[PDB]
Design a protein around this ligand. Structure first.
Ligand SMILES: CCCCCCCCCCC1=C(C)C(=O)C(OC)=C(OC)C1=O
Ligand SMILES: CCCCCCCCCCC1=C(C)C(=O)C(OC)=C(OC)C1=O
Ligand code: SF4
Ligand code: SF4
Ligand code: SF4
Ligand code: SF4
Ligand code: FES
Ligand SMILES: [Ca+2]
Lengths: 589, 905, 213
């Protein structure tokens, strides 16, 4: 039985516990291709269900995702409660290694849900995002304001009636009045945040760290309330890097959305490509062969080494040593030589396809892979012994912005931070995707404290394990097809397209109108370069995505930022920013 | 009936087969040879499903869902493994000989064969041998032929012969060398041959007019509109690309024009893409021709209109309801004149009085196919209202349909129906000045002058009911034919009487009304159908006004020093010399038109109006249905200096500048509400379409498909900065793909049909409640008037017998589907299809004059000694000259007129 | 073959950019021309980029900063974090709607002379992101000197655009002193690279097959 089959998920013990707790007429179970039990629950019992899941013997301790969905345009809703809007809550229990997805149905006029922030503190930014893009109000939320759009924005962009393109609206006319109005909108108002901008002894200092700061890894701004050098409170202001990629997912075909998936986490590349194409293959019912899995593992581990090299060099640069970034980018250029050879592009390859990859491996890729595998470990050991074993770097890093497993779980922290708290939870081992079971590699974990130094050394060990994976896949690569034999493989193989009429017809209708994926819900969760990246795709049975929800780890890390750096100095914040491994396309999407 | 599809219980209609029942429920079964209009023949063998007779049955039997009735207690499986493999094998067998032609095929992206190859999931080729090839034929200027792409599904021949009644298309050849076409090269002379490009699931028959300037279906910007080439008002989907009208697709209206258009309405759209059209307001200063924008044109026009003592307005039946009303409200009630002549207006008002006061229900075009005995009086339907002639052919085959239904044979078994009803058919009696194209199925054809046709109609009315006025002087053989017609009409259950204003006589319409009244008096379900001339003739008749002669004499006597002509050439309804003298004598001629007419030399100001592809409006068709047509594209998006607006917008802003000295661009709903407020008889045009505030769950209706391409590059030669998409404040549509085009949306105006997996015109299946039936959530357009409680009285003005006077020749009209329309003949593709101007003569009259066939004779009408070559017409009665109406220099107003000095020159 | 721009923020002009451009002739003097050539050489051979980054294009720009490309050889590595000390704004990333006032402010905070290089399809026209929250090109409100197509442009394309900027600077005319002479900025109307390279681009016949490496 294939793993993409629509599973009703009535064999999960969490469903039985929910039946024995709330009764058999309290919820509906939706059969999806997510691999996760989807439970439609009533709005009145949402907090009780959340408390019951939090108080389980092996509880669901993490809020993975929280977002809305416009169901007004969804034609195929058989077996679902009647809804104009819906809110889904994706929760993870690491102890059971299980997920659940609670869905709440809302009418068009009664668009209010009880807040989830008391059960999970990381729900704050998710609820602000759901209010900003869908207009759904959360009762009891502390500060429900726009988080992706500026405060002087009319309408909610992820609603179906909102226009997706900039050409629908008037072209961007920057006048003096508009500049003044948007500058007053962008000015930080501490009375809105309850910052209390003064003390009897002295005055607090309000500083904009970002958008134009060397320490900020993008266009975002942390507003710091300071006394002298110490941070009293922080307001991380995001939404400056919003590209509307989910609304773009509603606007492109299944095949033509792959380059947009590539730019979600621009240091990730094929790592960003994999969850989307895996979810689309779950929707289509495509089981890719072994060679496709090994090639995709190759490219994603190569890009993981690339991203980790950039992260380590960036951390060393923000600590103060400006030398190893040059050599780390030289190693990045070696990886880029291999990636240019394979995919034809440097940093956004867009090489993964539905059912396979764009081309076969060119003749001679193993020579460049062997060159990189010989070049890498001496350079990495040099970086370690030159900067990562530096006592000044250790003084700037060890003990700085430290949190335990409780803070990592309550804020949805994934990736190197969660493993640095001692929780051994990696997606490539817990829920193995793309044939990662065939590769012998270790998962580094920490001692229980998630320092800057601990996260950086964990990423160094992850780089070494990725080098081991690359060596294993270089020594054993299958000799088969680079595309699946499914009819929904988009696009079909090129030579058959160029000389057969069936293949020409399939190519013609798949690159123009798009592949028709039948109406189902799919979900794929992978271990990204910066944490856990997930794609949740709702298909309406058409050639375009009805809903594309992208869960990213940098969003959770930036929401965790005020709770881990409050009371510290600004230097600790600089090291914390350099040691988080975030980019801002990842956050704002 | 109750069926079980894949274990799911469904309630279907037991008189339908399994294919249309399952397609109505939304179940996707592949099919080629079945069409909702043609029937089931079981040719392509693509619709296979596995049938079980019991709920507990494992083996089953592969049957054809198109040939299997949807009886109660049938358990069918569509996605069973055996059925799916057989359907994939049928697609594979069709793919063995199919050419590698999809990039160079006009049907690519609109192909049913592509959609069904993808739907069955066949994408691997194991056939390694050669593919058969075919030569191609020249089918004329409209249809391009590519025989290699054929799958031998027999849809073309079934439509063209068993539906359209054509005679030059057929199947030839053998085992796998089947050819579909003509026995030689030549033009397909059926008036409905253009539907072959949508009937054919492959790219064999393609639109050559669209193939000249070809774009794909996703690149097309569509709109729902009404065809403006005659009075039937078929719903069309005009689609444009790069600022020019590319294609006219069929728009499904289950009430009017369900699957089929006529060739004039499908290939006569080329006048929109003419380069001589006015694109700006142009003002004449002596010999100089200066160009204004909208504001200066309004200010100058209002200044000269205020500096005049009386302003009159000449409308047109070519204009919409709103533009004619805006002219009427600009110039006043008493100063508004309809652009048609006095006789044309008299015939039009008589036809309207018969329709909305005669007490006889006027059927819709779909309902014409259900009437038993058809009597056509005076109308040449196949050349003026051709789609009505197609529905008349269907009503004629209704006899074979009922005879096969008497033998417990299903409705969809079209081959068995044609086998049982071999040549027996419903009675059809056509009267004309000559032979018609309905004569192959007509029970009788009466070739006579219009006076004698009217006398035969009055004799039929007198023989059906003795209270009708009698006509004395009928020959005994004609009396025998009349009593044959009377016995056929009296024995019918639903008789239909079809007349119109194109016959050129009032007494023909009076005789048709008397026949309908006599049939109603016997207790019969009689229907009557008047065929008007232009698209909005009935709306102009309802709104009313003076004739063109009254406006001409008002200009000639000097009481009118300002004339506003709305979309009229004025040479079609009156003599060119008198019109030219009247417009030259008037000191201000202001012409709102979108086509370069001949009266623009004398025009002091020309307003570049918008055609149907660039304007919104309402048109009233021949049966009194108000239909809204929507704008397809904004003309100023590509060409920035184009100032081309709606004619009602022109005239409303002109009246606002006349009154308050302010330019006011209104909205379509404001003009609509003005019509409903001022004219109570046009009150139904408000409900023809919903207003601009209508939304489908908050979003508008998309004019283009969701895969519309080239957005950031289609205007990059002008400027690299892409402008905002044009905003439609008039309608509920948007000039973008950011909108709704779902098959399950609660609307009646569908711009185009597309569904996931259905890119062909078979995508209209998803937009109907049942396939081949009504559109889902009702058809667009509402009827203006209902059938009255009481009817008219008998018209006692029986005309005298036509006596051929010496010297004077009565002009017999000869209408042509290609040539007799004002705007269709301006299309460049119609030049190769329009017949040469030939004057038709009797052999006896030509022998008296010494003329043989071919040579040229000259006749003078209103000081115009024009010379035409002579064609001998045996069926034409002596004393008449046959002239082609609507040609160059021969107006349709010439019908019924005299002709002096007919000499060989 | 020159274009003249004069700026006036305080004048009656609401829409950005607050400048007026006409087409003029070259004003260029036996020593003033040579001194103008010398200052043009000094400005073109010492360009200090602004440490302003928006998106992935900035990551490729700082890849160009590193040792494997060495844009320091052109003297363009200093990378000031202050707008006052910078001479070149490389808009390397998407021009978001929420950051267009920020970009306008940072462009206002630079000092004369200033040059603008838009890097990538987002900065040029909005690129793939024809979306509600993206300005369709940074040239909607700032004047852009050099455009780089790409997504991201490779680092050598960034140095190619830097050399194009140097060639543009080396033949432009600027006010030598702010107390004597005309204060308008004269920039050359150079021939485009497309028509310049059309001769060598059309004549390309054969390329290496994609199966090779
Ligand atoms: C000039 C000497 C080499 C510099 C190399 C810098 C490499 C990237 C530094 C990290 C960083 C990233 C990724 C980044 O995206 C960013 O935001 C725009 C920064 O602030 C300017 C950064 O500092
Ligand atoms: C009139 C004299 C002008 C001198 C200008 C010197 C500019 C600075 C050069 C050295 C330098 C410093 C201090 C510097 O801060 C720096 O940033 C890390 C560099 O690398 C990009 C440098 O090369
Ligand atoms: S008829 Fe259809 S399948 Fe055949 S070549 Fe044309 S587009 Fe392709
Ligand atoms: S020409 Fe077209 S309609 Fe006719 S049999 Fe062939 S595929 Fe069918
Ligand atoms: S019958 Fe008349 S309205 Fe219909 S398509 Fe033909 S010309 Fe147009
Ligand atoms: S052009 Fe491409 S690489 Fe550059 S900012 Fe835009 S998405 Fe990133
Ligand atoms: S559709 Fe039934 S055999 Fe053709
Ligand atoms: Ca309009």
């Amino acid at each position: 039985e294939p793993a993409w089959q629509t599973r009703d998920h009535l064999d999960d013990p969490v469903i039985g516990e929910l039946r024995n707790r709330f009764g058999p007429d309290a919820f509906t179970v939706q059969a999806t291709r997510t691999g996760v039990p989807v439970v439609w629950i009533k709005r009145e019992q949402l907090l009780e269900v959340g408390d019951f899941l939090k108080k389980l013997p092996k509880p669901y301790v993490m809020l993975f995702d929280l977002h809305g969905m416009d169901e007004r345009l969804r034609t195929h809703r058989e077996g679902l409660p009647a809804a104009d809007f819906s809110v889904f809550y994706h929760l993870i229990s690491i102890d059971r290694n299980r997920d659940i997805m609670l869905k709440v149905a809302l009418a068009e006029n009664d668009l209010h849900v009880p807040t989830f922030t008391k059960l999970f503190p990381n729900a704050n930014w998710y609820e602000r995002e759901t209010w900003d893009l869908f207009g759904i109000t959360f009762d009891g939320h502390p500060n429900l304001r726009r988080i992706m759009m500026p405060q002087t924005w009319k309408g909610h962009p992820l609603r179906k009636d909102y226009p997706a393109r900039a050409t629908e609206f008037s072209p961007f006319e920057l006048t003096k009045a508009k500049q003044d109005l948007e500058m007053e909108a962008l000015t930080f108002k501490p009375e809105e945040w309850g910052m209390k901008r003064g003390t009897e002894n002295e005055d607090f200092m309000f500083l904009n760290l970002g958008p134009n700061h060397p320490s900020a890894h993008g266009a975002f701004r942390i507003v710091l309330q300071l006394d002298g050098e110490e941070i009293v409170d922080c307001v991380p202001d995001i939404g400056y890097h919003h590209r509307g990629a989910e609304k773009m997912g509603e606007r492109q075909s299944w095949h033509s959305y792959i380059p947009y998936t590539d730019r979600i986490e621009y240091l990730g590349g094929c790592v960003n490509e994999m969850p989307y194409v895996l979810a689309v293959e779950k929707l289509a019912g495509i089981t890719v062969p072994d060679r496709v899995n090994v090639i995709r593992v190759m490219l994603s581990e190569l890009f993981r080494i690339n991203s980790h090299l950039l992260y380590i060099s960036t951390f060393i640069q923000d600590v103060g040593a400006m030398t190893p970034v040059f050599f780390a980018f030289t190693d990045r250029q070696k990886i880029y030589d291999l990636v240019e050879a394979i995919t034809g592009f440097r940093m956004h390859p867009a090489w993964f396809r539905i059912g396979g990859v764009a081309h076969d491996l060119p003749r001679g890729w193993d020579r460049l892979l062997r060159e990189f595998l010989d070049w890498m470990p001496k350079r990495l050991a040099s970086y370690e012994k030159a900067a990562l074993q530096n006592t000044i770097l250790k003084g700037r890093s060890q003990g700085v912005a430290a949190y335990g497993a409780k803070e990592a779980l309550e804020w949805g922290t994934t990736g190197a931070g969660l493993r640095a708290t001692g929780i051994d939870f990696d997606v490539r081992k817990a829920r193995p995707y793309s044939g990662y079971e065939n590769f012998d590699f270790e998962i580094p974990v920490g001692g229980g404290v998630s320092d800057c130094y601990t996260r950086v050394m964990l990423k160094v060990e992850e780089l070494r394990q990725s080098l081991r994976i690359l060596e294993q896949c270089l020594n054993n690569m299958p000799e088969g097809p680079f595309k699946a034999d499914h009819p929904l493989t988009t696009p079909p193989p090129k030579e058959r397209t160029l000389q057969h009429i069936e293949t020409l017809i399939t190519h013609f209708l798949q690159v123009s109108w798009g592949p028709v994926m039948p109406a189902n819900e799919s979900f794929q969760m992978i271990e990204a370069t910066k944490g856990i990246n997930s794609y949740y795709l709702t298909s309406d049975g058409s050639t375009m995505s009805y809903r594309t929800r992208i869960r990213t780890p940098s969003y959770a890390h930036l929401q965790q930022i005020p709770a881990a750096i409050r009371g510290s100095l600004v230097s600790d914040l600089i090291v914390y920013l350099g040691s988080i491994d975030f980019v801002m396309s990842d956050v704002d999407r | 009936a109750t069926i079980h599809v894949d274990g799911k219980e469904y309630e279907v209609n037991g008189a339908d087969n399994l294919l249309e029942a399952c397609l109505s429920l939304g179940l996707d079964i592949p099919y080629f040879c079945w069409h909702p209009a043609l029937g089931s023949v079981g040719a392509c063998r693509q619709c296979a499903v596995k049938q079980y007779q019991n709920a507990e049955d494992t083996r089953g039997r592969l049957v054809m869902s198109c040939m299997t009735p949807a009886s109660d207690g049938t358990f069918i499986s569509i996605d069973d493994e055996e059925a799916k493999q057989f359907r994939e094998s049928v697609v594979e067998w069709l793919m063995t000989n199919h050419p590698h032609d999809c990039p160079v095929c006009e049907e690519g992206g609109n192909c049913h064969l592509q959609d069904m190859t993808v739907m069955t999931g066949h994408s691997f080729r194991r056939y390694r041998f050669t593919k058969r090839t075919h030569r191609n034929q020249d089918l004329g200027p409209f249809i391009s032929h590519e025989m290699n792409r054929c799958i031998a599904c027999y849809r073309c021949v079934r439509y063209y012969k068993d539906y359209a009644g054509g005679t030059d298309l057929g199947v030839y050849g053998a085992h796998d060398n089947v050819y579909f076409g003509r026995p030689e090269d030549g033009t397909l002379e059926s008036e409905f041959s253009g539907n072959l490009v949508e009937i054919c699931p492959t790219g064999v028959f393609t639109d050559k007019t669209h193939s000249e300037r070809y774009n794909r279906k996703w690149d097309m910007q569509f709109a729902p509109s009404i065809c403006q080439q005659c009075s039937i008002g078929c719903n069309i989907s005009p689609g444009e690309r790069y600022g020019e009208l590319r294609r006219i697709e069929n728009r499904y209206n289950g009430t009017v024009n369900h699957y089929f258009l006529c060739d004039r309405g499908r290939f006569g759209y080329g006048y929109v893409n003419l380069k001589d059209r006015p694109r700006q307001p142009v003002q004449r200063r002596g010999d100089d021709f200066i160009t204004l924008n909208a504001e200066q044109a309004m200010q100058g026009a209002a200044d000269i209109l205020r500096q005049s003592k009386k302003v009159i307005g000449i409308g047109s039946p070519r204009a919409s309801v709103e533009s004619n009303f805006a002219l009427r409200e600009l110039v006043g009630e008493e100063n508004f004149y309809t652009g048609i002549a006095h006789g044309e207006q008299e015939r039009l008002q008589l036809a309207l009085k018969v329709l909305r006061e005669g007490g006889i229900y006027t059927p819709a075009l779909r309902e014409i196919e259900s009437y038993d005995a058809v009597l056509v009086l005076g109308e040449d339907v196949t050349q003026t209202g051709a789609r009505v002639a197609l529905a008349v052919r269907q009503a004629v085959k209704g006899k074979a349909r009922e005879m096969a239904a008497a033998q417990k044979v299903a409705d969809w078994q079209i081959a068995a129906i044609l086998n049982i009803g071999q040549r027996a058919k419903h009675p059809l009696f056509v009267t004309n000045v000559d032979d018609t194209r309905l004569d192959d199925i007509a029970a009788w054809t009466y070739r006579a002058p219009v006076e004698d046709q009217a006398r035969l109609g009055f004799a039929i009315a007198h023989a059906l009911d003795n209270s009708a006025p009698a006509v004395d002087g009928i020959e005994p053989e004609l009396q025998s034919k009349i009593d044959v017609i009377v016995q056929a009409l009296a024995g019918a259950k639903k008789p239909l009487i079809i007349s119109g204003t194109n016959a050129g006589s009032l007494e023909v319409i009076q005789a048709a009304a008397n026949v309908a009244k006599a049939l109603k008096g016997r207790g019969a379900d009689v229907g009557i159908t008047m065929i008007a001339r232009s698209v909005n003739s009935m709306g102009l008749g309802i709104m009313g006004g003076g004739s063109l002669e009254e406006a001409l004499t008002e200009l000639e006597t000097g009481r009118a020093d300002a004339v506003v002509v709305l979309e009229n050439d004025l040479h079609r309804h009156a003599s060119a010399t008198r019109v030219n003298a009247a417009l030259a004598k008037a000191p201000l001629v202001m012409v709102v038109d979108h086509q370069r007419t001949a009266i623009m030399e004398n025009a002091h100001l020309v307003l570049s109006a918008a055609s149907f592809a660039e304007s919104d409006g309402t048109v009233i068709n021949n049966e009194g249905r108000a239909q809204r047509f929507f704008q397809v594209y904004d003309p100023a998006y590509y060409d920035s200096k184009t100032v081309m607006l709606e004619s009602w917008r022109w005239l409303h802003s002109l009246h606002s500048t006349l009154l308050s000295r302010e330019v006011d661009w209104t909205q379509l709903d404001h003009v609509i509400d003005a019509v409903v407020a001022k004219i109570p008889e046009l009150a139904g045009i408000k409900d023809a379409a919903p207003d601009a505030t209508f939304r489908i769950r908050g979003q508008k209706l998309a004019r283009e498909p969701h895969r519309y391409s080239g957005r950031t590059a289609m205007r990059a030669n002008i400027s690299v900065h892409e402008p905002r998409q044009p905003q439609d404040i008039d309608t509920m549509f948007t000039f973008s793909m950011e909108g709704n085009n779902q098959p399950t949306a609660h609307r009646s105006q569908v711009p185009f049909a597309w569904a996931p997996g259905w890119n062909s015109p078979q995508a209209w299946n998803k937009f109907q409640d049942e396939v081949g039936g009504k559109l889902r959530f009702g058809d667009p357009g509402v009827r203006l008037f209902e059938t009255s409680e009481n009817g008219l009285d008998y018209f006692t003005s029986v005309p005298a017998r036509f006596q051929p006077q010496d010297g004077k020749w009565r002009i017999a009209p000869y209408y042509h589907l290609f040539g007799s329309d004002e705007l269709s003949q301006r299309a460049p593709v119609f030049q190769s299809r329009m017949p040469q101007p030939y004057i038709k003569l009797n052999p006896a009259d030509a022998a008296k004059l010494g003329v043989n066939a071919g040579t040229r004779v000259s006749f003078s009408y209103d000081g115009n000694t024009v010379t035409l070559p002579v064609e001998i017409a045996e069926g034409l009665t002596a004393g008449q000259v046959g002239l082609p109406m609507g040609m160059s220099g021969i107006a349709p107003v010439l019908a019924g007129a005299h002709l002096e000095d007919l000499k060989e020159a | 073959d020159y274009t003249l721009t004069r700026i006036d923020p305080n004048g009656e002009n609401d829409r950005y950019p607050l400048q007026k451009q006409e087409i003029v002739t070259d004003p260029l003097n036996v020593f003033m021309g040579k001194l103008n050539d010398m200052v043009n050489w000094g400005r073109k051979n010492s360009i200090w980029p602004y440490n302003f980054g928006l998106s992935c294009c900035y990551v490729e720009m700082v890849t160009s900063f590193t040792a494997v490309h060495d844009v320091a050889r052109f003297g363009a590595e200093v990378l000031r974090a202050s707008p006052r000390q910078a001479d070149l704004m490389v808009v390397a990333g998407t021009c978001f709607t929420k950051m267009a006032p920020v970009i306008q402010r940072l462009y206002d905070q630079m000092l004369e002379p200033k040059w603008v290089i838009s890097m990538g399809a987002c900065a040029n026209s909005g690129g793939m992101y024809d979306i509600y929250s993206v300005v369709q090109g940074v040239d909607k409100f700032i004047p852009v000197d050099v455009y780089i197509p790409g997504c991201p442009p490779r680092p050598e394309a960034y140095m190619q655009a830097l050399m194009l900027l140097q060639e543009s600077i080396g033949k432009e005319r600027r006010p030598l002193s702010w107390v004597v002479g005309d204060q308008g900025v004269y920039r050359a109307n150079m021939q485009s690279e497309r028509e310049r390279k059309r001769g060598e681009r059309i004549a390309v016949t054969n390329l290496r097959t994609p199966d090779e490496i």
